[PDB]
Amino acid sequence: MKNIESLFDYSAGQFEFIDHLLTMGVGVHFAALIFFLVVSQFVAPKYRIATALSCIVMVSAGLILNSQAVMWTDAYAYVDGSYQLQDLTFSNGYRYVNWMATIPCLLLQLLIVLNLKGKELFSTATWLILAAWGMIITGYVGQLYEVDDIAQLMIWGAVSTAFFVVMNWIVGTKIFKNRATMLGGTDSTITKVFWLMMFAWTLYPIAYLVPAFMNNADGVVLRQLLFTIADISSKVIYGLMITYIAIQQSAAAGYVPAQQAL
Ligand SMILES: CCCCCCCC/C=C\CCCCCCCC(=O)OC[C@H](O)CO
Ligand SMILES: *C\C=C(C)/C=C/C=C(C)/C=C/C1=C(C)CCCC1(C)C
Ligand SMILES: CCCCCCCC/C=C\CCCCCCCC(=O)O
Ligand SMILES: CCCCCCCC/C=C\CCCCCCCC(=O)O
Ligand SMILES: [Cl-]
């Protein structure tokens, strides 16, 4: 009721496209899960947790996308030529709470493949997770006002973006201070991962602002389209690059199953 999805009736095409986006996302994530599961054996024990975190991200994101898809079809019914709201079951907030768990996993596999260890990994991970949670919690409170108070959404978004900026500065600083430790030529691959993150993660605040510049049923479709692109890029494609780095460093470090896989 606090989100814009509940304000509109949807044509069969709008509704079915949203449903097909969420279901396609479920399919992509669970198919990648199998990939990450099977290739974890070609990863040296030092990096194997990284690929394991990808499996957790796939299932976590897949289950929430599957949840959203069923709530979507539970909330609406085709009545008099359009899908109209019938039950209070759909909300984007479930995406936000899920990020509390998936964003730490995404950040953690990055630090693992960067060769961080001991105190620094623990210290760096704690500040990154605290910043990320501050970003998500303020963003969560913000989207509660995307219908009733768009000014408050913009102010909470401003506070959330500050955490986002500080979070990226820590990530970027550690990447560029530690890329020289990376093996198998992955010191150049990790730089591409940082820019993939910058691009993919920034699509979320854009989707967050849709209610402010496209408050209509088409904006609801656009937001889900942006979520779908960001999810696939920040979770799947990102995970593939992390796994490639984990495997390439494993081989350069003398892990035979990795060398045999490459
Ligand atoms: C909400 C209104 C406030 C808006 C605020 C806008 C200011 C953006 C500033 C920084 C963004 C850059 C994010 C971090 C990018 C990487 C940082 C970096 O590269 O520094 C590392 C250095 O190279 C050592 O290795
Ligand atoms: C599924 C993976 C990730 C990394 C999800 C990331 C979400 C964000 C980076 C959200 C950022 C926000 C900002 C920067 C300001 C508006 C509120 C948001 C929470 C959407
Ligand atoms: C190698 C095996 C690859 C893994 C294949 C993954 C299988 C995914 C199967 C279909 C996704 C299920 C989602 C169905 C719920 C849709 C909800 C609805 O809109 O009614
Ligand atoms: C209050 C917020 C606290 C957040 C703390 C986060 C805790 C996680 C810190 C890093 C530990 C990562 C565990 C994986 C270690 C991998 C070692 C290995 O590969 O053998
Ligand atoms: Cl997620």
* Shortest-distance ligand to the CA of residue 53: 4
Range of the domain at 14: 4-261
Residue nearest to atom 4 of ligand 4 (CA): 126
Residue nearest to atom 1 of ligand 2 (CA): 231
**201 CA → ligand 2 middle, Å:** 6
Ligand 1, residues 154, 164, 168: which to mutate, most atoms within 8 A of Cβ? 168
**Sign of the C-alpha dihedral computed for residues 20, 23, 27 and 33 taken in this order:** positive
Partner residues linked to 84 by β-bridges: 77
- Who surrounds ion ligand 5 at CB < 5 A? 61, 98, 102
Q: What is the resolution of this structure in A?
A: 1.8
Which numbered atom of ligand 1 lies nearest the CA of 169?
A: 14
Q: Is the CB of 97 under 6 A from ligand 3?
A: no
**Within a 10 A sphere around the Cβ of 222, how many other Cβ atoms?**
15
**15 CA → ligand 1 middle, Å:** 39
Token pair recorded at residue 243:
């796994």
**163 CA → ligand 1 middle, Å:** 11
Number of domains observed in the structure of the chain: 1
Backbone angles phi, psi at 2, to 5 degrees: -80, -10
Which numbered atom of ligand 1 lies nearest the CA of 158?
A: 1
Q: DSSP letters of the chain? A: --SGGGG--B-HHHHHHHHHHHHHHHHHHHHHHHHHHHHGGGS-TTTHHHHHHHHHHHHHHHHHHHHHHHHHHHHEEEETTEEEE-SS---THHHHHHHHHHHHHHHHHHHHHTT--HHHHHHHHHHHHHHHHHHHHHHHHHHTTTTT-HHHHHHHHHHHHHHHHHHHHHHHHHHHHHGGG--TTHHHHHHHHHHHHHHHHHHHHHHHTHHHH--SHHHHHHHHHHHHHHHIIIIIIHHHHHHHHHHHHHHHTT-HHHHHH-
Token pair recorded at residue 161:
């973006």
Technique behind the model: X-ray
Here the CATH number for the domain that contains residue 174 is: 1.20.1070.10
